[PDB]
C-alpha cells in the first residue's frame with residue numbers, strides 16, 4: 228500500500244521505472260531510496276514479496292508485512308555510512324536475483340526462499356557502525372552477553388526475530404510451528420555465516436561441494452539433501468553481501484565511499500576513546516584503491532569464481548564486471564603509468 232510509504236503519484240511513477248530492474252543485477256537501489264522517502268528495504272522487500280507471491284503463499288497480510296518491515300528498517304542506523312537499510316535492501320535484492328539464477332531453478336522450496344530473503348533483510352539490523360573487535364575491546368555489554376563470538380551477527384538475529392513481537396509485526400504468524408522452526412534454523416545459519424571470520428571456512432566448503440556437483444540434463448543443479456541446500460543458501464547470502472564490486476562501477480564506487488566513510492568514523496571513535504586506530508580506519512593513511520584491489524583478489528574474486536563455477540555459466544557477466552572493476556581500481560592507484568583509467 229503506497230499510502231503507508233507516503234509516496235505521491237509522481238514519485239510512484241519514478242519508482243515504477245526503477246523497479247523495472249527488480250529481477251536484474253543492474254537495479255539502482257540508491258534511486259529506489261530516493262523515491263521512497265528513504266525506505267528502500269521496505270519498498271524493495273514489498274516488491275520482492277509481491278513478485279514472488281510470498282505474501283499469498285505464507286498468508287502474510289500487506290498490513291503485517293509493511294508494519295514489520297518499516298519497524299525493522301527503522302532499527303537500521305541511518306547515521307551509519309555503510310551498514311544501514313540501503314545496504315540491507317541491496318543484499319535482499321541481490322539475493323532475490325541469485326535465487327532466480329537458471330542453474331538453481333526449482334531447487335529451493337518456498338520456505339527456503341522466504342528464509343534467504345528474510346535473512347538478507349535482517350542480517351545487519353541495529354549495526355552500530357563499528358566492528359566486533361571494537362565492541363570486544365571497549366568491553367561492550369553486547370560483547371559480554373555474546374562472549375565475544377559473532378557479536379553483531381548474533382545481535383542482528385536477536386533483533387530481527389524480537390521485532391516480530393511488536394504490534395502487528397508477526398509476519399510468521401500463519402506458518403506452522405514446524406515451518407517456523409525450520410525457517411528460524413536456516414535464517415540463523417545464513418546470518419551467522421555473514422561473519423567475515425567464517426569466510427575462508429565457507430569458501431572451502433563451497434569449493435569442496437563444487438568438486439562433487441550433481442547436475443541434471445538441463446544443467447540444473449541437483450540438491451536433494453538439506454545440508455547441501457543450506458550450504459548453497461548461506462554462501463548465496465554471503466555472495467550478495469560481498470556483491471558490491473560485481474555491480475556497475477557507478478554503484479560500486481558509492482559502496483566504496485560508504486564503507487570507507489564508516490571505517491573512518493570508527494577510526495574517529497577509537498581516537499576519541501584513546502584507543503589505537505585500526506587498519507584502514509585512518510583517513511590520512513588509507514589507500515582506498517589498493518584496498519579494493521586486495522579485497523577483490525583475496526576475498527571477493529575467489530568467492531565469486533567458485534560460485535560462478537557452481538552455477539556456470541550464469542554468473543559469467545558478474546565475473547567479467549568484477550574483473551573490469553578490479554582493473555579500474557588497479558589503474559586508479561596513484562603512480563600507475565599503464566592505461567590509467569580502465570585495465571591492465
Ligand SMILES: COc1ccc([C@@H]2CNC(=O)C2)cc1OC1CCCC1
Pocket residue numbers: 423468469471472482483486487507518519522
Ligand atoms: C566496497 O568495499 C567493501 C564493501 C563491504 C565490505 C564488508 C563486507 N561485509 C560487510 O558487511 C562489510 C568491505 C569492503 O571493502 C573492504 C576492503 C577495503 C575496506 C574494507
Ligand SMILES: [As]
Pocket residue numbers: 232242263269270271273274
Ligand atoms: As515501494
Ligand SMILES: [Mn+2]
Pocket residue numbers: 350351421
Ligand atoms: Mn555485517
Ligand SMILES: [Zn+2]
Pocket residue numbers: 314318350351421468
Ligand atoms: Zn551486510
